[PDB]
Amino acid sequence: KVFGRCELAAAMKRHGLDNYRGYSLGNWVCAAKFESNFNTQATNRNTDGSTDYGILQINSRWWCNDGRTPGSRNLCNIPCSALLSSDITASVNCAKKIVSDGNGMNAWVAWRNRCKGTDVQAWIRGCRL
Ligand code: NA
Ligand code: NA
Ligand code: NA
Numbered sequence: 001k002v003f004g005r006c007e008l009a010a011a012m013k014r015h016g017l018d019n020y021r022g023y024s025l026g027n028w029v030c031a032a033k034f035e036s037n038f039n040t041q042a043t044n045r046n047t048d049g050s051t052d053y054g055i056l057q058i059n060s061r062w063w064c065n066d067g068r069t070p071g072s073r074n075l076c077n078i079p080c081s082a083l084l085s086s087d088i089t090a091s092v093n094c095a096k097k098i099v100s101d102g103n104g105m106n107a108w109v110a111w112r113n114r115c116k117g118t119d120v121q122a123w124i125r126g127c128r129l
Contacts, residue, residue, distance in 0.1 A: 063075050
């Protein structure tokens with residue numbers, strides 16, 4: 001499923017991401033825009049053989065099991081395909097674990113490079129929240 005911007009803002013807010021670990025909602029919407037273009041089905045291979053999955057591009061090197069990242073971890077204890085569903089629960093719950101691990105949103109390269117340091121509240125402008 002490809003979410004609209006305000007559609008995703010509402011879903012992320014209902015799932016408890018607004019102000020999670022101090023990151024306002026616009027941070028999460030911005031991250032999803034630039035990680036996946038709001039597309040739950042997005043997948044992208046990393047050069048180390050791992051793959052990023054879903055609307056927040058969560059990495060099989062550490063966070064989920066995709067059956068083809070030998071020796072990697074599965075910290076969210078899920079198949080990576082769970083991160084591709086139209087239901088964003090698994091992606092949100094795994095993102096909450098990632099952002100709590102000590103590095104915050106710096107885990108998301110697109111957030112670091114395209115959201116951090118910008119007016120991220122713009123990403124929820126015009127939305128009914
Ligand atoms: Na992989
Ligand atoms: Na893994
Ligand atoms: Na990531």
